[PDB]
């Protein structure tokens, strides 16, 4: 499992994402009952609160598995929403922010 | 109805 430093780094980056102005579509799970089509086409839904619960409960054995789930949030967003939609653009902006933060942390 | 999105 991840040591204390790695857990702290994941938590720090996740908090920076949760507080970003463009995080609003990604803070909680998509409600599959209220958003038709989502369950059908998005096979692995993911959101920041779920990532937080996974991190806290020891479900990420390493940094790479954490980053995969963060990226999954944005990959799902790209599929379900038009690139030019408010959510689509929020997702692209958040991906850019994450990749910069990730690169600045581990370089 | 057909198509994706949250509009």
Numbering used by the authors:
A (entry chain A): 2060 to 2166
B (entry chain C): 7 to 13
Task: Please give me the paper's original passages concerning this structure.
Chromatin remodeling complex NoRC (nucleolar remodeling complex) interacts with the rDNA promoter regions of silent genes repressing rDNA transcription. It consists of TIP5 (TTF-I interacting protein 5), also known as BAZ2A (bromodomain [BRD] adjacent to zinc finger domain protein 2A), which is the largest subunit, and the adenosine triphosphatase (ATPase) SNF2h (sucrose nonfermenting protein 2 homologue). BAZ2B shares 29% sequence identity with TIP5 at the full-length level and harbors similar domain organization. Both proteins contain a MBD (methyl-CpG-binding domain), also known as TAM (TTF-IIP5, ARBP, MeCP1) domain, AT-hook DNA-binding domains, DDT (DNA binding homeobox and different transcription factors), and a PHD (plant homeodomain) zinc finger adjacent to a BRD at their C terminus. Our crystal structures combined with biophysical and mutagenesis data demonstrate that PHD zinc fingers recognize N-terminal unmodified H3K4 tail, whereas the TIP5 and BAZ2B BRDs recognize H4K16ac and H3K14ac, respectively, with specificity pattern KacXXR.
